[PDB]
């Protein structure tokens, strides 16, 4: 678990994220797709995207980023009391989309990177620590659902 002080930084930061949800979502998906191009054959709608320029011009990628970060926001705002919100998403990713948990690790890293890159010298050391714990908490509760389903 995180402290109250820690939860407060996380939710402070997410409020800022929410001011520019599309632009944050776009950058997080582009970071993932470019650093780990195999994530991209999970997506028929995205397989044509052969360049960074094409990824950035794509309205549908923006729309997708908005869906993703909005779902992550709902979870985060539960301050660790997220069983009902986390459950369906763990179940769909393991069962239908078949996403290894290592891609959840990659996207967590993508978020911390994008935060510094969009707000250079505005993303405090205390802020990075709280967010990182928030993201690890999330990943940890996912791993428990993944073990339950024997997903490798
Ligand atoms: C922060 C972690 C993530 C969150 C909050 C999230 C959120 C979502 C949401 C809300 C949906 C739509 C409803 C559903 O199918 O459950 C979705 C669908 C999907 N996700 Fe994720 N996702 C995450 C990570 C990932 C990653 C890392 C991948 C692949 C590398 C992935 C692949 C997919 C696929 C293939 C779909 C189906 C797309 C569709 O219905 O068009 N997800 N995700
Ligand atoms: O729909 N879930 C996704 C999460 C991150 C990247 C692409 C899709
Ligand atoms: O930011 N939300 C979006 C919704 C539809 C298309 C593109 C972006
Ligand atoms: O744009 N349609 C979507 C459906 C499910 C997840 C993300 C996007
Ligand atoms: O690692 N699989 C996931 C579980 C829940 C939401 C997104 C991804
Ligand atoms: O059965 N698969 C597992 C998934 C996550 C953690 C441990 C086991």
Swiss-Prot record:
Q: Does the keyword Ribonucleoprotein apply?
A: no
Gene3D superfamilies reported for this sequence: 6.10.140.2100, 6.10.140.2110
Q: Where in the cell is it found?
A: Cytoplasm, Sarcoplasm
**UniProt keyword annotation of DNA damage present:** no
Q: What is the enzyme's class at the highest EC level?
A: oxidoreductase
SUPFAM superfamilies from the UniProt entry: Globin-like
Q: Which domain of life is it from?
A: Eukaryota
- Per its record, how is this protein called by name? Myoglobin
What is the protein's species of origin?
Answer: Equus caballus
Which taxonomic lineage is given here? Eukaryota, Metazoa, Chordata, Craniata, Vertebrata
């Amino acid at each position: 678990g995180l402290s109250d002080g820690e939860w407060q930084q996380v939710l402070n930061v997410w409020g800022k994220v929410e001011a520019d949800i599309a632009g944050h979502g776009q950058e997080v998906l582009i970071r993932l797709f470019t650093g780990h191009p195999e994530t991209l054959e999970k997506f028929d709608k995205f397989k044509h995207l052969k360049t960074e320029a094409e990824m950035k011009a794509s309205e549908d990628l923006k729309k997708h980023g908005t869906v993703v970060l909005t779902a992550l926001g709902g979870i985060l705002k539960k301050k660790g009391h997220h069983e009902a919100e986390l459950k369906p998403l763990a179940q769909s990713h393991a069962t239908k989309h078949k996403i290894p948990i290592k891609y959840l690790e990659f996207i967590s890293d993508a978020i911390i990177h994008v935060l510094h890159s969009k707000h250079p010298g505005d993303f405090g050391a205390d802020a990075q620590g709280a967010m990182t714990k928030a993201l690890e908490l999330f990943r940890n509760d996912i791993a428990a659902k993944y073990k339950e389903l024997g997903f490798q």
